[PDB]
Design a protein around this ligand. Structure first.
Ligand SMILES: Nc1nc2c(ncn2[C@@H]2O[C@H](COP(=O)(O)OP(=O)(O)OP(=O)(O)O)[C@@H](O)[C@H]2O)c(=O)[nH]1
Ligand SMILES: O=C([O-])C(=O)[O-]
Ligand SMILES: [Mn+2]
Ligand SMILES: [Mn+2]
Ligand code: NA
Length: 624
């Protein structure tokens, strides 16, 4: 980029650049970098190249600074422990900026929307001015050029993230394609502008907790889709700071998708091969902390079945000229929930995470390894544990050894069952789409939608127990339509209309739509379904249905498996009565709840087809 004019020496940041060159940046990239440097006043500017040496040195630097620790039991793995105020997404501080509120969320009848948070442009400007001026004083501003999707993909989009956090830098290296090749690929093209600061300019005004720079009181994660900007202040935690992931690849991207005729979704993408040598790709939207990563890299218990992972969290999809729904994973790594992860529940993850992996808020064993709730693996006598709170911890204490939302951040290329087409620019053809969440009562193991319009309603109607992915506590059953409640880039009613419109386009090969429940419990609080690898039995049913197998019976909520259609061999004890039961009383209550929620929260933007599906379901239940 060209040197900016100036009458003094305060606008050209060249003298502060410690890696790279402002002169060699594309013009608009330099303007973005330099304009935000003038604002944030970093001491240095480091333009990331994405090299292993850059990565190695930056890790070493955080190490000597006490910001991360080396996990010496493994190969190039590292541990960060955060300030306990900065441990997850915060939905209440996550906002979208548009001229009119209705462009961002439907106007709720009750007056409080549960489908996003809108902030006026003028309110945002004030919030921005109270945060960012001088916020990087005494820090390095890192410039991360990154690509969502393989360098080529028709589906791929480039961002530049500016951050004062080396932790963000290292994590983005794993979770996106990052560095010099991205700038070369961008040229003078368009990019998403992403600005991040931990909100702790030097000298420190507040006491630093556990060497983790953050500003909880001022935390704000903002999205400005008209400006193509994401602006995030005060949090270093993944979902808030790795701007390509939730901020770009769901929130911004879903709005772009609506405008441009594609889809951006909170979905895994997996490839499943049967004993007859046939492979199908499926997508699944479950809410945060509801099993996507476990399903995407499942080790099937059924002989002759194979599952391969394309992506575990984000799907970008578009109908091609042939009418196939084609999906790509825009991420480059897995940012997975650690606790619960074991050789038993997710052996494929256990394999992936022992090299080149960054862990956040898990426990450390005295021999340099990791520990967490449900790791289900004994330690040798004499091995001791440091909790994620950096305290000595014993298996019989008050609190967990790892944070409930503790994460691993691991390269996708490492996964032993990574799908061979996971970086194909063409994407993979999706043949079914699975919705589901945590319902301890009433909702059977699996059912199939009656039609496209009904499947879109099933997505819209999704409810699920609260999890630790964000700020929500306890186990209350919440609405989480399409697993996208925290992530809609625009009015949910319009998003429903967008999904419905897919049925109207030329030669569209619409996928089969299913709904699952891994989480139904008996009257004792015991899970009725073993889950995990055993979920291959459900996927088998879905596979045959996609092929047109006569294996379904009609019920009021959709098609279910016929008696004996599911392979339950090796699971002789399963209470099929309760697991597959559909109660009129439960479903009457359920449909009334859905009706009130859609009326209140979607209101004037609720598409007629969805209100029709509600009426029809209500009618079918009334005839039980
Ligand atoms: N009982 C049971 N638990 C499961 C199952 N699948 C996943 N889990 C657990 O649910 C928690 C979260 O699962 P993940 O697969 O990481 O969820 P995710 O959808 O990828 O979550 P986000 O990354 O937050 O979007 C972990 O503790 C898992 O061990 C299952 O089939 N049965
Ligand atoms: O990080 C995630 O994947 C989430 O919170 O859903
Ligand atoms: Mn997620
Ligand atoms: Mn996940
Ligand atoms: Na720390």
């Amino acid at each position: 980029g060209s040197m900016p004019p100036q009458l003094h020496n305060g606008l050209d940041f060249s003298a502060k650049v410690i890696q790279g060159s402002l002169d060699s940046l594309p013009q608009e990239v330099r303007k973005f970098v330099e304009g935000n440097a003038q604002l944030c006043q970093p001491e240095y500017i480091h333009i990331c190249d994405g090299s292993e040496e850059e990565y190695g040195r930056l890790l070493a630097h955080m190490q000597e600074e006490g910001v991360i620790r080396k996990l010496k039991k493994y190969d190039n793995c590292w541990l960060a422990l955060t300030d306990p105020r900065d441990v997850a997404r915060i939905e209440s501080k996550t906002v979208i900026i548009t001229q009119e509120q209705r462009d961002t969320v439907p106007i709720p009848k009750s007056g409080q929307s549960q489908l996003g948070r809108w902030m006026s442009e003028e309110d945002f400007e004030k919030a921005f001015n109270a945060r960012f001026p001088g916020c990087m004083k005494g820090r390095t501003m890192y410039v991360i050029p990154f690509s969502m999707g393989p360098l080529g993909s028709p589906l791929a989009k480039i961002g530049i993230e500016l951050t004062d956090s080396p932790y963000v830098v290292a994590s983005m290296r794993i979770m996106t394609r990052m560095g010099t090749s991205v700038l070369e690929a961008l040229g003078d093209g368009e990019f998403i502008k992403c600005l991040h600061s931990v909100g702790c300019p030097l000298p420190l005004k507040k006491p630093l907790v556990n060497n983790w720079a953050c500003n909880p009181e001022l935390t704000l994660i903002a999205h400005l889709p008209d400006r193509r900007e994401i602006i995030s202040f005060g949090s270093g935690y993944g979902g808030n700071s790795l701007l390509g992931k939730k901020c770009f690849a769901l929130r911004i991207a879903s709005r772009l998708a609506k405008e441009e005729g594609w889809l951006a979704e909170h979905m895994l993408i997996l490839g499943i091969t049967n004993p007859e040598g046939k492979k199908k790709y499926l997508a699944a939207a479950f809410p945060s902390a509801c099993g996507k990563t476990n399903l995407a890299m499942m080790n099937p218990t059924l002989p002759g079945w194979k599952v391969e992972c394309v992506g575990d969290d984000i799907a970008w999809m578009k109908f091609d000229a042939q009418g196939n729904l084609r999906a790509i994973n825009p991420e480059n790594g897995f940012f997975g929930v650690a606790p619960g992860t074991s050789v038993k529940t997710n052996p494929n993850a256990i394999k992936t995470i022992q090299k080149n992996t960054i862990f956040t808020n898990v426990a450390e064993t005295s021999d340099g390894g990791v520990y967490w709730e449900g790791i289900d693996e004994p330690l040798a006598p004499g091995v001791t544990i440091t909790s994620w709170k950096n305290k000595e911890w014993r298996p019989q204490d008050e609190e967990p050894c790892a944070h409930p939302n503790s994460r691993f951040c691991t390269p996708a290329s490492q996964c032993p069952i990574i799908d061979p087409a996971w970086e194909s620019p063409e994407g993979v053809p999706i043949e079914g789409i699975i919705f589901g969440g945590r319902r301890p009562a009433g909702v059977p193991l699996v059912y199939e939608a009656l039609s496209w319009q009904h499947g879109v309603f099933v997505g819209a109607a999704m409810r699920s127990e609260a999890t630790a992915g964000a700020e929500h506590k306890g186990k209350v059953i919440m609405h989480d339509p399409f697993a996208m409640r925290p992530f809609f880039g625009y009015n949910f009613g319009k998003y429903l209309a967008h999904w419905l419109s897919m049925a109207h386009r030329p030669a569209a090969k619409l996928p089969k739509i299913f709904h699952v429940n891994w989480f139904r419990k008996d009257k004792n609080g015991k899970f009725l379904w073993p889950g995990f690898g055993e979920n291959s039995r459900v996927l088998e049913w879905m596979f045959g249905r996609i092929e047109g197998e006569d294996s379904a019976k009609l019920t009021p909520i959709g098609y279910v498996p016929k008696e004996d259609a599911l392979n339950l061999k090796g699971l002789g004890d399963v209470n099929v009565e309760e697991l597959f039961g559909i109660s009129k009383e439960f479903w009457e209550k359920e449909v009334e709840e859905i009706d009130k929620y859609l009326e209140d929260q979607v209101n004037a933007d609720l598409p007629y087809e969805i209100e029709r599906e509600l009426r029809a379901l209500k009618q079918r239940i009334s005839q039980m």
